[PDB]
Design a protein around this ligand. Structure first.
Ligand SMILES: NC(=O)C1=CN([C@@H]2O[C@H](COP(=O)(O)OP(=O)(O)OC[C@H]3O[C@@H](n4cnc5c(N)ncnc54)[C@H](OP(=O)(O)O)[C@@H]3O)[C@@H](O)[C@H]2O)C=CC1
Ligand SMILES: NC(=O)C1=CN([C@@H]2O[C@H](COP(=O)(O)OP(=O)(O)OC[C@H]3O[C@@H](n4cnc5c(N)ncnc54)[C@H](OP(=O)(O)O)[C@@H]3O)[C@@H](O)[C@H]2O)C=CC1
Ligand SMILES: O=CN(O)CCCP(=O)(O)O
Ligand SMILES: [Mn+2]
Ligand SMILES: [Mn+2]
Lengths: 379, 379
């Protein structure tokens, strides 16, 4: 039958790509809700006009003032839309802290949650896991989607290791000395129209990989010492699972987020024609190499944060946001991003307690931000 | 509740590796029958002593006499061993189309057929299929083991293509002129697998891969035009499945037949520690290139034979067996192997008829062997 889909973050990269998959597959999906921030209000309004969906939410009141016929506006607008809309699937493609409450609300409705919002898991952690039922959360990102597919190759008891691939970023194979003089531009901080500067930087710093390692633990219930990372420059193999017999199962496709998006939406059913497959008519190679964890310790730090548990991963992420921004403003050098994360985490043991509420997570993030600010400024 | 396993061809490459898996896993497996040709009595006698199994078949009458007290001897020994031994699994690791009757007898008992002896299924065609219940034939071949694992990545209707990898053999990259000079000693080399001299030859000539394409169609019911072959010199990726959404699922491990053996014996349950896993703590690459079908047409000829159906696959194999014997004896050049197969196949119009009995298959092979000898005489 047709799945009713709520798209949260309809004006961003994931959201718009999802809407294309849905437009291409009217047999499999129908949009029944759209939520956006308001920065791209004009796009949301064009989306209302194109899709015919009037069930929309805008967070920013100022932006909402420009329209006068938005059913959900102001803070918690997305959350209210989720609470009040009958749906089969909620795609949470919201950015940052504010994806958390809608994740919780969507889980309570009993819909499947196609999750892109990293903060829901990296920050929300045990709040989100205690609220979600088995199979309810389906990951949107390429590595997690790949692991979900590869896990089909055996029972849960047969898994030995999860292996995330990592592009390695622009500084793949760079020495510590090389990294000393990395500039914001080199770190891929261009005013690229769709993605924010943080995504390319997190990729370059290997912090994104650490975040993905944390999310892997929470999604698939695999201990951190069994979650590995290999550097794979082509990004054709999106991740792999190694089983107890020594067999490894791997997922491969030319880069294209429409594949994992389509699969998250239709899970467990694949969407015909979603993306192009690997073509073996011209010679190619898939290369693998280890990550030098002395030069790139962000993944080791993520495992430490993850193992400590509670709000420690919220701390890891919030420290990064602050240090990364400080790097982009020229307040610190590149190697000092992960240096500050380590300094903040080392000081953060009070946050190992499990959060009872969203406010607990926010307090952990507040603490981590100001602690990172002190480290940056020298105060 | 150990599985009771009869091991046909115990003294060969697959047989010995299989006994090693069983020896390491006495909780899961027990040997209850051994069959061999009689050429390696030292090995067989050691196997009798180490397993404690006296329920033994020896094909060669004189060799069986030399041992004394062999319960089954003569060319029907292996077949009669299968018929009269209660077992849960029959591992058929005989070589050549002579494994046909043991294969048919094994299926008739209701036991799982762990099939290394691809030739018996290639020769038997729909006759073997009609004797099998669904999933009764479980492949030991590394490619088909990989395919079975990767097919867990979706439903049947989601399968777009099956992709077999091929090492490309010792003469990968060689021109037709280069092949003219190939010696039996050069064809006895293999870059990635340690095997008997016949399977090694078949690998060098690509006839092995042709046999495996036919085996794929017969095992999995996928049409020949959706079975691709890609050359992968590392033999780390063992085969892949491409799904309708563009996703490809691949199986990978360092070349070690103990992996597919262990899984075939214990299907669906994996066998802990059966083989070493891919090691991502050191650099490596997985390379792919197209097969050069002009220089190596054996796979195309297999597709032709397979599409024709009936007893045509038996003809393909039998012609190879005769031609291969003549190459190893120094009577014909290396290119003549596949030239003879082409000559025989294209004279075989009458053998497209579906086999009703074993005798139909035997008739087809008898003709093919004579026709192959005619081709050899003409050179
Ligand atoms: N792009 C990718 O491939 C990857 C995605 N992810 C993560 O998935 C999430 C979504 O991906 P992406 O589309 O690129 O993120 P985007 O930044 O491109 O889009 C974010 C969406 O959230 C909306 N939004 C912002 N603030 C609010 C608010 N207060 N209430 C409701 N909605 C709000 C935005 O609306 P408006 O535009 O009007 O502000 C926008 O539609 C991201 O957080 C990203 O980190 C993870 C790995 C990689
Ligand atoms: N070797 C490998 O790695 C791989 C093999 N395979 C397949 O597995 C099958 C077995 O191959 P492999 O183990 O390499 O071959 P081998 O030649 O190593 O072994 C052949 C076995 O069959 C026995 N045998 C020979 N003739 C007869 C006969 N007339 N009656 C009864 N037994 C006989 C031999 O006994 P003896 O010599 O003692 O008389 C020996 O035990 C082949 O069909 C091959 O295609 C597939 C994947 C890879
Ligand atoms: O199952 C494994 N084999 O048959 C050995 C494959 C060697 P090849 O790809 O060169 O035919
Ligand atoms: Mn990713
Ligand atoms: Mn094989």
């Amino acid at each position: 039958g047709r799945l009713r889909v709520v798209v949260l973050g309809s004006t961003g990269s994931i959201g718009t790509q999802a809407l294309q998959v849905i437009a291409d597959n009217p047999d499999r999906f129908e949009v029944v809700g759209l939520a956006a921030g308001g920065a791209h209000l004009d796009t949301l309004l064009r989306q209302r006009a194109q899709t015919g969906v009037t069930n929309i939410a805008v967070a920013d009141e100022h932006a909402a003032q420009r329209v006068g016929d938005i059913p959900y506006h102001g803070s918690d607008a997305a959350t209210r839309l989720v609470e009040q809309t009958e749906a089969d699937v909620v795609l949470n493609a919201l950015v940052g802290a504010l994806g958390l409450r809608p994740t919780l609300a969507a889980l309570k409705t009993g819909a499947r949650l196609a999750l892109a919002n990293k903060e829901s898991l990296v920050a929300g952690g045990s709040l989100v896991l205690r609220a979600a039922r088995p199979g309810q959360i389906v990951p949107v990102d390429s590595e997690h989607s790949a692991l979900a597919q590869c896990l089909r190759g055996g029972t849960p008891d047969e898994v030995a290791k999860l292996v995330l691939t990592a592009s390695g970023g622009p500084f793949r194979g760079w020495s510590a000395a090389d990294l000393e003089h990395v500039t914001p531009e080199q770190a891929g901080a261009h005013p690229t129209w769709s993605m924010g500067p943080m995504n390319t930087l997190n990729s370059a710093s290997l912090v994104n990989k650490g975040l993905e390692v944390i999310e892997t633990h929470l999604l698939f219930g695999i201990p951190y010492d069994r979650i590995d990372v290999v550097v794979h420059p082509q990004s054709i193999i999106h991740s792999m699972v190694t089983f107890i017999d020594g067999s490894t199962i791997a997922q491969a496709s030319p880069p294209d987020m429409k594949l994992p998006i389509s699969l998250a939406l239709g899970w467990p059913r694949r969407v015909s024609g979603a993306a192009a497959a690997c073509d073996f008519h011209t010679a190619s190679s898939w290369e693998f190499e280890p990550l030098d964890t002395d030069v790139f310790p962000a993944v080791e730090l993520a495992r430490q944060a993850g193992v400590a548990g509670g709000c420690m991963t919220a701390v890891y992420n919030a420290a990064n946001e602050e240090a990364a921004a400080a790097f982009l403003a020229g307040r610190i050098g590149f190697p000092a991003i992960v240096g500050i994360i380590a300094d903040v985490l080392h000081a953060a043991d009070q946050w190992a307690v499990e959060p009872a509420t969203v406010d607990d997570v926010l307090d952990a993030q507040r603490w981590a931000r100001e602690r990172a600010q002190r480290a940056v400024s020298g105060m």
